[PDB]
Amino acid sequence: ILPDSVDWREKGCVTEVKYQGSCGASWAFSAVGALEAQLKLKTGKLVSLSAQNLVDCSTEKYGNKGCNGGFMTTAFQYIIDNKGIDSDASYPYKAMDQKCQYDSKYRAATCSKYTELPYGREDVLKEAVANKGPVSVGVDARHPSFFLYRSGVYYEPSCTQNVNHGVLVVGYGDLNGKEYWLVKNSWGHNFGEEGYIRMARNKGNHCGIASFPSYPEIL
Ligand X SMILES: CS(=O)(=O)N1CCc2c(c(-c3ccc(Cl)c(C#Cc4ccc(CNCc5ccc(Cl)cc5)cc4)c3)nn2CCCN2CCN(C3CC3)CC2)C1
Residues making contact with ligand X (CB under 6 A): 22-24, 26-27, 62-63, 67-69, 71, 74, 138, 162-166, 211-212
Classified as helix, coil or strand, 130 is helix
Beta carbon of residue 123, minimum distance to ligand X (angstroms, whole number):
20
Beta carbon of residue 74, minimum distance to ligand X (angstroms, whole number):
5
Classified as helix, coil or strand, 127 is helix
Residue nearest to ligand X (CB): 63
DSSP structure class, residue 56? H
Largest CA distance in the chain: 49
Beta carbon of residue 43, minimum distance to ligand X (angstroms, whole number):
27
Q: Which of 153, 135, 158, 144 is nearest to 200 (CA)?
A: 153
Beta carbon of residue 111, minimum distance to ligand X (angstroms, whole number):
17
* Burial class of residue 56 in the structure, from the number of CB atoms within 10 Å of its CB (0-12 exposed, 13-18 middle, 19+ buried): buried
Residues 6+ positions from 52 with CB-CB distance below 8 Å: 28, 88, 91, 92, 93, 94, 98
CA angle, residues 96, 214, 31, in degrees to nearest 5: 25
Beta strand segments in the chain, E: 6-7, 85-86, 107-109, 113-116, 135-139, 153-154, 165-175, 178-184, 196-200, 214-217
- For ligand X, the closer of residues 74 and 205 by Cβ is 74
Beta carbon of residue 127, minimum distance to ligand X (angstroms, whole number):
20
In degrees and rounded to multiples of 5, residue 128 shows phi and psi of: -65, -40
- For ligand X, the closer of residues 120 and 173 by Cβ is 120
- For ligand X, the closer of residues 16 and 116 by Cβ is 116
- For ligand X, the closer of residues 37 and 163 by Cβ is 163
Beta carbon of residue 27, minimum distance to ligand X (angstroms, whole number):
5
Distances (CA, A) of 103 to 40, 86, 216: 21, 7, 21
- For ligand X, the closer of residues 71 and 215 by Cβ is 71
- For ligand X, the closer of residues 43 and 68 by Cβ is 68
